[PDB]
């Protein structure tokens, strides 16, 4: 009378979404989304200047590995979750 299934892969997939789905709860409290505050970020860019600029990406992360590798420990762990 033991249970049987084609594969346990579906179960594992189910576990992943649980972690992703509950991650919002862990990082963000149900009582307050606080997410809408982030959406105001766009308005600030406009306030700072109509023409966006003074920003960079990719290159910045280039030095991160050098600093993190050199450093014994950094805020960002090996697990990117």
Swiss-Prot record:
Top-level lineage group: Viruses
Transmembrane regions listed in the UniProt entry: 7-27
The keyword Transmembrane helix is assigned to this record: yes
Post-translational modification: Phosphorylated by host CK2. This phosphorylation is necessary for interaction with human BTRC and degradation of CD4.
Compartment(s) where it occurs, according to its Swiss-Prot or TrEMBL record: Host membrane
UniProt activity-regulation remark: Ion channel activity is inhibited by hexamethylene amiloride in vitro.
Family matches, as InterPro entries: Vpu, Vpu_cyt_dom_sf
Entries under SUPFAM superfamilies matching the protein: HIV-1 VPU cytoplasmic domain (SSF57647)
Keyword vocabulary terms for this entry: AIDS, Apoptosis, Host membrane, Host-virus interaction, Inhibition of host innate immune response by virus, Inhibition of host tetherin by virus, Ion channel, Ion transport, Membrane, Phosphoprotein, Transmembrane, Transmembrane helix, Transport, Viral immunoevasion
Note: HIV-1 lineages are divided in three main groups, M (for Major), O (for Outlier), and N (for New, or Non-M, Non-O). The vast majority of strains found worldwide belong to the group M. Group O seems to be endemic to and largely confined to Cameroon and neighboring countries in West Central Africa, where these viruses represent a small minority of HIV-1 strains. The group N is represented by a limited number of isolates from Cameroonian persons. The group M is further subdivided in 9 clades or subtypes (A to D, F to H, J and K).
Entry text on domains: The N-terminus and transmembrane domains are required for self-oligomerization and proper virion budding, whereas the cytoplasmic domain is required for CD4 degradation. The cytoplasmic domain is composed of 2 amphipathic alpha helix that form a U-shape.
Family stated for the protein in its record: Belongs to the HIV-1 VPU protein family.
UniProt name for this protein: Protein Vpu
């Amino acid at each position: 009378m033991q249970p049987i299934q084609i594969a346990i892969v579906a179960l594992v997939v189910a576990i992943i979404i649980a972690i992703v789905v509950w991650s919002i709860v862990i990082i963000e409290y149900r009582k307050i989304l606080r997410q809408r505050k982030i959406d105001r970020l766009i308005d600030r860019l406009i306030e700072r200047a109509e023409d966006s600029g003074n920003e960079s990406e990719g290159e910045i992360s280039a030095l991160v590995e050098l600093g993190v590798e050199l450093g014994h420990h950094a805020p960002w762990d090996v697990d990117d979750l």
